[PDB]
Amino acid sequence: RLSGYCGSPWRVIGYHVVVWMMAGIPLLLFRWKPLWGVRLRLRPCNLAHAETLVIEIRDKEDSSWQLFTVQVQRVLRYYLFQGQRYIWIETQQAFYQVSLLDHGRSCDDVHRSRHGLSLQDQMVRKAIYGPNVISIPVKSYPQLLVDEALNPYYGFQAFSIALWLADHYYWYALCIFLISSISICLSLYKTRKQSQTLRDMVKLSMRVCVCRPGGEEEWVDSSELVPGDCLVLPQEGGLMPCDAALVAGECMVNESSLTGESIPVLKTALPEGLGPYCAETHRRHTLFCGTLILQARAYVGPHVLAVVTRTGFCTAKGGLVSSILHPRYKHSMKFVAALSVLALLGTIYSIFILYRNRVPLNEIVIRALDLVTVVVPPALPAAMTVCTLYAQSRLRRQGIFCIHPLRINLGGKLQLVCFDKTGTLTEDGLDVMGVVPLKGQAFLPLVPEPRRLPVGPLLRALATCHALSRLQDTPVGDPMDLKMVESTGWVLEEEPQLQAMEEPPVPVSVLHRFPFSSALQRMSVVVAWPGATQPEAYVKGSPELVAGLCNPETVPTDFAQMLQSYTAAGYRVVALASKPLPTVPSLEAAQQLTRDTVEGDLSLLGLLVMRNLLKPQTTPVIQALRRTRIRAVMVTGDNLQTAVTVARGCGMVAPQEHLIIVHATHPERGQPASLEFRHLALSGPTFGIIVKHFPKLLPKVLVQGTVFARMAPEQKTELVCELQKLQYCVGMCGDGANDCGALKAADVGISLSQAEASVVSPFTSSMASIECVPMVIREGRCSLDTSFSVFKYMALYSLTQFISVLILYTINTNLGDLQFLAIDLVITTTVAVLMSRTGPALVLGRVRPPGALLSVPVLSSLLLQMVLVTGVQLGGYFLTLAQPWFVPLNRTVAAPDNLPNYENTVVFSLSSFQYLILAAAVSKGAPFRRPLYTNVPFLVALALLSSVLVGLVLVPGLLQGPLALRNITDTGFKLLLLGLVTLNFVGAFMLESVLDQCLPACLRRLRPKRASKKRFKQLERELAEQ
Ligand SMILES: Nc1ncnc2c1ncn2[C@@H]1O[C@H](COP(=O)(O)OP(=O)(O)O)[C@@H](O)[C@H]1O
Ligand code: ALF
Ligand SMILES: [Mg+2]
């Protein structure tokens, strides 16, 4: 990602203001290519040292952004671009981001001193790094009102209002203005809600203290953190201002709003060692933003000291917020082109008819302008943007809590869902099943049974090698750690904070404890006890990792079968190693905090066999997702056999399963295809070594691959990117923190076991089940179907209104004043506002919704529907003209003063029901949405409208004076018109429920072949090599 920056300070006075004062009219039409405006308006020639208005050149992205270099102080010229600050350097003589003294600099030799930020001239660090606060720009009511009238739609509406006011019409203009004001207030309410859901999510202000060198303490506001500072963390509480680094002491934070887990993580102080310092590998030495310190009193002295790393919008939480709250079709163009073509043809026909009627030109332009300016139904942007709001409002009452609806339509076109293993498909609580010793009788099994029989170092290695921590009620931590501690018989009591109780043979004390990270799957600990000449060091982790990190003679040639037999049953077994820890290493390592040499000559002691059970609400959702031709793979980090037996516990798709056999270390890395005892399974290193050597077999294994075990936290993002590169819609459903970065690089992200709409992912659920992905998919498909139906209904309404105007303008006839208002408000707006009902059903569908709005079936449906409408219209016209009626008085009183007549009455009476008929004929679906008899408010509204409509075609005693209607004593109000409107109402349904069959599909299916999404031919070519 590269881009240039060129600008100029200012231009000389003169015509540079007149040019933009005169060329301001075509600004509404010059929205395309915005570089021309900034190039012709203000673009003088100057040097390259005093830029004030800088514009960027398009190199990789077609966009444009305007900036302003503010100067508060040297020069100190800087601007705000997407929240990131850019300063002007003197050495490189170019713009530089805020990345100095980091990512390759600020070594430990100058970072492990922390003099204390002596009282110098603090005027250069506040204007460069900015204030230590996350201020969200908010807008007031006039500020939000002045910038919303920039769209050309509002200008067209204002022009229509002016044209209606300049024609002695104060009724239609009033309703149009009311609808526009309703749309404006709805948009302002939506913007206010979208701003309030973010302003309340960020942290608030507090009162903290900043330490100074010596005996100086001040109570300043909670904004003083600058890169390279040192603050104090009293009260043993959380509420972290921004990112920081703990250099002295240990602490435990709660990264629940940054990772997605409520498990306490232990933070270790930064040790010595001259090397690079970056925020990519020291995940246990720094403190991120939004962390809650559980219990950390002091380690050396009165209290611990923390070092500030970064402040502003580039922190861990602020950067993620700015990156995930960043603002990111072709058939619509042809649709509006055809609509404009039909409109111009109709207006040409109308002007030809008017010229044939021998009418002077003074009355032709006023009608032509009105006809060309009235083509779009009111509340167009208010009806297409309210469906997402209604969906977001109705999803809150089910469990899904989204931060902002942006990718709702993407859920309806999903084809691959990734599921986790622990926390998603299985229960989080484990169960112990005994200890399998490996040191008894010269590396021999002792028939392990589930009991509590510790001999020798088994008590300390099982009761001390952990990361337990109590908060006034009980030790809380990892579930496996709790299950191991409770199955031992030891109680942790309050270094005095790491002591135990009930020690039969000898009391024990924990000197040092190393936490667990995502990079390495192990954890060391220092275990000492009075009565020995040297302590011991234990470590717990995966057997495959500790097998090549110990003595070559620790287990005979029986582990490859024992581990497989223990993992092929559904249990979870781990390995525990031990180190003799002689006097010299224990003395020279307890004062340096080393890790490369402490994990050397290890010795296995025993194995902990756990038990993981699946959730009883997993098989129905899995079957429902499998019976809808939707691929579902499992991406975990456990052993291969564990994932295999977990997948076999349900058995979705596994014909002739194949696995990659271990002990494959060929120089050419040639992995063959073996048998288990169509689909393949990939491991961590197995998938890692097939992406660099041979870059030609990746799309062949990724399709059939459904079991991804032993994965790495840094490899899941690469897999997601490789899956998305093939034009897919893969979505991961993770629970732990090992797959946090993969959710930020996918289309959809599940946030199970979260709350308050965590920022870790836009979609967030409030239940521990997998029944949220199908719900999201069906909600998205229902929203897409509703939007398509609304667009089709709007197009049909526009076309039928054009046809009505055309048939009304045959010689000289105009509709009523209040009739247009009653049609656009009661008949059109009321049914369009309440059209977002009838959500998704409880049964999914195998057929996928279409992604285009200009298909052959829908176009043929619209064409046949309009043919039927014009046919029934001409039939009604012939019927009302073939009756013994009176004679008109045209060509002598032609003026807007003879509104009550028999010309437009029957036309309006026949056209008013057309909208109500077409509204209930396009918004319906059996497998996508709910039937029409489910929503009660819309049903009673339609009933009230139908009653009001039928109340006028019989006994015309009222609602005729102000409405400009007349009375008739003929059979017009009788079945003569009722039998016709009912016939049309039935014919519309009969014609709409016939083309929805698979006839057009099978007619347009046998003609073409598989190309342009030739996925079928791709699968055929893939299977052709078998
Ligand atoms: N008590 C423990 N102490 C240290 N490491 C452990 C412990 N339990 C599991 N591990 C490590 O975790 C890895 C598997 O993690 P996994 O279950 O995939 O995490 P997640 O379920 O969050 O994806 C194993 O390689 C193992 O080394
Ligand atoms: F099984 Al997991 F994150 F819980 F891979
Ligand atoms: Mg998880």
Author numbering: 36 to 108, 161 to 415, 422 to 587, 609 to 791, 821 to 1169
Provide excerpts from the study:
ATP13A2, which is mutated in juvenile-onset Parkinson’s disease and autosomal recessive spastic paraplegia 78, is a transporter with a critical role in balancing the polyamine concentration between the lysosome and the cytosol. The P-type ATPases transport substrates by coupling ATP hydrolysis with protein phosphorylation states and adopting a series of intermediate states, consisting of E1, E1-ATP, E1P-ADP, E1P, E2P, E2-Pi, and E2, in a process known as the Post-Albers reaction. Here, we report seven cryo-EM structures of hATP13A2 in six intermediate states, importantly including the putative E2 and E1-like states, thereby providing a nearly complete atomic-level conformational cycle spanning the Post-Albers reaction process.
Adenine nucleotides (AMP-PCP or ADP) or phosphate analogs (BeF3− or AlF4−) were used to stabilize hATP13A2 in the E1-ATP or E1P/E2P intermediate states. Then, in the following E1P-ADP–to–E2P transition, ADP release from the catalytic center would induce the outward movement of the N-domain by ~25°, which would subsequently alter the architecture of the TM regions, causing entrance pocket Site1 to open toward the luminal side of the lysosome and allowing the recruitment of a polyamine, after which the polyamine would move deeper into Site1 in the subsequent E2-Pi state. Four intermediate states (including E1-ATP, E1P-ADP, E2P, and E2-Pi) were solved at relatively high resolutions (3.2–3.7 Å), whereas the E1-like and putative E2 states were solved at medium resolutions (5.6 Å and 4.8 Å, respectively) probably due to the rapid dynamic equilibrium between the E1 and E2 states.
